[model samples]
Target: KVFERCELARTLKRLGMDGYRGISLANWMCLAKWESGYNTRATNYNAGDRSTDYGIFQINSRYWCNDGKTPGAANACHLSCSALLQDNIADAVACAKRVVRDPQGIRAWVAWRNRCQNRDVRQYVQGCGV
Candidate 1:
C-alpha cells in the first residue's frame, strides 16, 4: 500500500491527475478519519449496525468491484483497493475526472452526486478535460 502511494504520486502527475493529489489525500484522510480514523483494516458490523461496506475506500464490494477484474484490468485500482493501492487511487481519480468535467450526469458519478446531495467535491486540475 505504501509503495503504491509512493509510485501513484508520480503516475498521477504523468497522467495529468496530479491536480487531484490534494483531493485524494483529503478524501483518504477525511473519510478515513470519520469512517475509521485512517483504519485501513476497518470492517463493517452488520444489518443491525452501521452501513454494509469495508476497506480504505469502503465501497460496497459488490458494486465497487463489479466494473472489472480489477487485479487483471489495466486500471484495477479504479474499481477496488483491496487488490492494490493503485486500484484505490485510480478509482478515486477515475470518478474525479468525470466529476470535474461533467459535474453533470453526462458522465455518471458526479451526475448522481449532483442529483443527490454528495456534490461537495470541487477541487481539481486546471485543464483536466479531454
Candidate 2:
C-alpha cells in the first residue's frame, strides 16, 4: 500500500507514533517519506551488510528483525522481517518503536539523519490535521 501523505500521518498518529520517544509526528512522516515513500511493501537490499530493509520505515534485518539470511542478525524485534511488509503496519510500527528505544533514537535510520535531522519537517504533516 502506498499511503497518501495525510493518510500515513494519521495512521502513524493512531498507532501512537506522534511524540514517540520524543520524536515528533512530522519527523516520522519525514523518515517514511525518504525511507519508503509510505509504501508498505517497500524493500531494499543492502549489499554491504547482506541485509534487507523492509516496509515503510525501512527497518533493517541486520539488527532488528530476522530474515533468515542476514548474517549475524540480532532479531531484536523477535519477529520475522516479512511482518513489516504487511499493509496493517502494526508490526512495522512496533519494531520502529523498539529501534528508537536505543540510544540512537530515530537516528537509527540514516535516511532520517540525512533528510530530517535538524531540518524543517513540518511540511510533511502540515495539512494532515494530525
Candidate 3:
C-alpha cells in the first residue's frame, strides 16, 4: 500500500500519531520516504548481518520483530515480522511508537540522521490538515 504523502499524513494524524512523541509529521513522512517510499510491503535484507527491515517504517528484524527464520531476533515489539507487511499500519504505528521511546528516539533510523535530520521537511504535510 503506497499512499500519497498528504493522505498518509491525514491518516496518521487521525490515528493519533500527528506530531507523535515530539516528532513532527513531516519528519516522520520524510523518513518513510527514504526508507521505503511509503510502501507498506517494503522489505530490505541486510546480508551483512542477515537481518531484514520490514514495512513502511522498516522495523528491523534484528531487534524489533521476528521473521522466524532470522536467528537471534530480539522481537522487542513482540510481533511477527510478517505482520508489518500489511496495508493497515495500525500495528506498525504501535511498534514504531515503542521504537521512538527507545533511548535513541527517531535517531534509530539512519535515514533520518542522513536525510531528515537538520532539514526542514514541512512540505510533506503542508496542506494535509494534520
Candidate 4:
C-alpha cells in the first residue's frame, strides 16, 4: 500500500518512532518518502553488488534481509527480504532499528544521509499530530 504523508506519520507514531524514539519523526518520514515514496513494494536493485534495497526503509539485502536466493546474505534481522514488502511496516521498522544498532546508526541509509540528514523536515509530520 502507498501511504499518504499523514498516514505514514501516524503509522510511525504507532511504531514508537515518533521523535521520542532515537530518530526523529520528521527524519524517518522524510527518509521513507524519498527512499520509497511510502510504497511498501518499493525495491531498487543495486548493480554494484547485485544486491537490492527493500521496503519503505530500503533495507539492504546484502546485510540486512536475505532474499533467500541471494547467497552470503548477513540476514541480520533474521527475516526474509520479502517480509518487508508488505502493507504493515512493523517488520521493516524492526529491521531498520537493528540496522541502526550497528556502527553506522541511521547513516546506514544512504538516502537518509543524502536527503534527510540535518535538514528541517518538520513538514513531513506537520499535520499528523505525531
Task: Give the residue spans of candidate 1 off by over 4 A.
Answer: 1-18, 21-24, 45-51, 66-130
Residue-level error in angstroms, candidate 3, position 127: 1.6
Q: What's the TM-score of every candidate structure? A: 0.35, 0.98, 0.96, 0.93
Model 4: per-residue Cα lDDT over 1-130, one tens digit each:
8999998898887888764337787888988999999999999988878889999988889898888656577899999999999898999998887887787777878888899888888888886877
- lDDT of every model, 2 decimals: 0.38, 0.93, 0.89, 0.86
The candidate with the higher TM-score, 2 or 4, is 2
* lDDT per residue as tens, model 1, 1-130: 3223334334455546533533443232333334433333555534543233444434433333433422332332344434422434455446445433533322232223333234443222223331
Q: Residue 117 error for model 4, in Å?
A: 1.3
Query: How close is each model in CA RMSD to the real structure?
Result: 9.2, 0.7, 0.9, 1.4
Q: How accurate is candidate 2 locally (lDDT)?
A: 0.93
Clash totals, every prediction: 3, 0, 0, 0
Ranking by lDDT: 2, 3, 4, 1
Error of 2 at 116 (Å): 0.6
Q: What is the lDDT of candidate 1?
A: 0.38
Best by lDDT: 2
